Design a protein around this ligand. Structure first.
Ligand SMILES: NC[C@@H](CCC[B-](O)(O)O)[C@H](N)C(=O)O
Ligand SMILES: [Mn+2]
Ligand SMILES: [Mn+2]
Ligand SMILES: [Mn+2]
Ligand SMILES: [Mn+2]
Ligand SMILES: [Mn+2]
Ligand SMILES: [Mn+2]
Lengths: 318, 318, 295
């Protein structure tokens, strides 16, 4: 019996495309709670958080957009995640853009300092505020969290509260296929392990999961933080997303990652981000993406493709 | 060269979605007979059976749907299949819902004491009339056929003619992804071998086919009954079906299963079920599903990806 | 960007043999910009019955002399199609490099006929089986049986199957990829073609080798093709040898598109294959970043 807390983080200021703030409601509408309930989960829904707005919030170094707004909302979200983690709940945060991982990972690390991160995404999201070309904070969350990158990251307004909480050996990426040249340099120079789409093509997702766990939990059991960007899946499967990139995970591969995460029994927090129902060309495309998000979450807590989630031990007789 | 019999079974009373009775007409219209002719098949067309309706056949024990109609249609179907097999043909039955495997497998076992079954489906179709939640008989056919379950299956009206004819070690499932808790218990408890979509994700379809044949025909040659539900394919490939489940077989995997079955030279009967042209959103969706059904059957009788079905003896010289 | 993992010299030619709208569709999808972004030294050449053997044979003679000039100057020649018949011209022109090996990526063997016969005119062992066509006398066979490897085969005609089987032409059909996986297929392909010695590689890529969901705007689409990932993998491994000498990107037919999304997706895919053949990858790393800025 897993105790699962659901937190809606209708965060959109980490990027420029509107509608990602409607991701939590779309996921709940696709039957998230009914699905987790059927798995036997003990649920708590915090509903959607109302983040303190920052009306006077100008560009940092004439590039970084909404720093105070993103920094403050993450500060507040980190308090909610920390509380849920303290109360014994596996914390599911529904996005919202991927800048929310600053708050969920920060919050989680307060009570789980030995956590490890499995980052599932088409993107590395590891640009520093000095390497970003877009100035979108959803493309930089990992830079604020990485201990080894601290001397390369300037102090941004609203971001001072953040204490880097993950080391380069404690994060593994899966699904990479659109990596900026500064991000590629960071991954190689700081020895951050990753399994790009090319590594999945060669090894197969089973070997990718085995190797990920060898790297992270090969020495001891640790709390796992699964940060899952819906754009890790091929755009044909997850169209309702801001930055789609062709040649992503199949439905089967995404289910396989989540099932392996469930099988460890170590999942402590999960982010499901970048579902933007507004970017779907049709209502069915929006529902398809939202149904996929529920499937990743439910598989992370026991949903299988073999029907082995529920205890059944005796057949009825005539 | 193969002797192949074709039987149309326009039957829908094993489920609640209207239209699956039009599956045989849709498959025939897709050019099935012309395709089998082009492969050099000696063909016998038994036409499309008209099933004796049961006007008074309502809900049994507040659960079982249409038992008298399903039992009778299967009794009639078993006699036609028995005729085709005893005449010496490899029996192709076009569905119609998956409750029709009661008739095809019963009819086939009347001549093949050592028959084995390869069941390709998103579903196990092995609930008993006591474990079913829906009461739909297309989700229960294997329970009536399996010897090990005889003491778990109640006597339904119209089912007294059925004799269990297969052992738990004589059926292998491929493609499973939507299994009920009692069905998972039955599969594990009785040691029925299955390769779910997760097993295919891990092993690959080559190893799945090798292991299937090792389990079934590794000790001795045996007639093979291929019970193929079109919903084993991903819904993007087979949209015109009643219970679609995302994350199915690819076109390539489906053809590979069919090619490997052909390569044994032991195919004795094939069911191609659950094509429901009415559930397609367009004519092209219905046609794609029908064409896929024809490709499975043709590959099961020799159609290949390398174009080696037709023998070429001499190249023209100048 | 000033630093790159590798610098290649690349020549681009448009051969519009609605398949004629193919080179224009590829160009409009930003091909030149993409190759420039990879640190390539670019040279754009612009856009150029028996039993149309004259017109096909003529257009191919112009293409073969343009390809021969580009490869003579030391450029890796890229030809935008147009139908696959242009491969007679490009492989002949490139051969004028005699020890060239071919990697034919197609749903079809293109090798008795009923764009489906280019390999018959080029293969040495098939010379005593091919008749003297009008405006085809200038062609001499250049590639032997053990120098062409097919990848992606799924629609092979009975006389083609006999040719492949009896002339011992090694191939990896869709069924072979299903069994081995694309990694093993590339490892085995290179074991066959360059295991003995290094050789200029001719990659003739038909867009229909990919599944029709990915490349819908093509002439002869065949279901159950290569995924986007498999095709990129082929191109990346070809790049990783450091031997790519010529490449054809054929059968993009923008007049067969039933929507703008089907038109743009097919052209974008064709740009992706070419870019991956000259260094573009899923991991990045093609562009070399020196140092991180400090606050
Ligand atoms: N959720 C699927 C269904 C069975 C589908 C039968 B099939 O489509 O395979 O024929 C369920 N287990 C049931 O018992 O009603
Ligand atoms: Mn992300
Ligand atoms: Mn992303
Ligand atoms: Mn079925
Ligand atoms: Mn089924
Ligand atoms: Mn071709
Ligand atoms: Mn082709």
């Amino acid at each position: 019996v897993h105790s699962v807390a659901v937190i809606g983080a209708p965060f959109s200021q980490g990027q420029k495309r509107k509608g990602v703030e409607h991701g939590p409601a779309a996921i709940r509408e696709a039957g998230l709670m009914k699905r987790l309930s059927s798995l036997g989960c003990h649920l708590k829904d915090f509903g959607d958080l109302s983040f303190t707005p920052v009306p006077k919030d100008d560009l940092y170094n004439n590039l970084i957009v909404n720093p105070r707004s993103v920094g403050l909302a993450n500060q507040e979200l980190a308090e909610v995640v920390s509380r849920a983690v303290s109360d014994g709940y596996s914390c599911v945060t529904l996005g919202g853009d991927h800048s929310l991982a600053i708050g969920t990972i920060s919050g989680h690390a307060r009570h789980c300092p030995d956590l490890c991160v499995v980052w599932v995404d088409a993107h590395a999201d590891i640009n520093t505020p000095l390497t970003t070309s877009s100035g979108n904070l959803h493309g930089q969350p990992v830079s604020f969290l990485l201990r080894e990158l601290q001397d390369k990251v300037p102090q941004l307004p609203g971001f001072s509260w953040i204490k880097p909480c993950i080391s380069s050996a404690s994060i593994v990426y899966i699904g990479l296929r659109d990596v900026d040249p500064p991000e590629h340099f960071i991954l190689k120079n700081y020895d951050i392990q990753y399994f790009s789409m090319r590594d999945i093509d060669r090894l197969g997702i089973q070997k990718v999961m085995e190797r990920t766990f060898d790297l992270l939990i090969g020495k001891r059991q640790r709390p796992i933080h699964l940060s899952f960007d819906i754009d890790a899946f091929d755009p044909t499967l997850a169209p309702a997303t801001g930055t789609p990139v062709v040649g992503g995970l199949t439905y089967r591969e995404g289910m396989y990652i989540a099932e392996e995460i469930h099988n460890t029994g170590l999942l402590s927090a999960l982010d499901l981000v970048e579902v933007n129902p507004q970017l779907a060309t049709s209502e069915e495309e929006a529902k398809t993406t939202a149904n996929l998000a529920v499937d990743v979450i439910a598989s992370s807590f026991g949903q299988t493709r073999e029907g082995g989630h529920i205890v059944y031990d005796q057949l009825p007789t005539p």
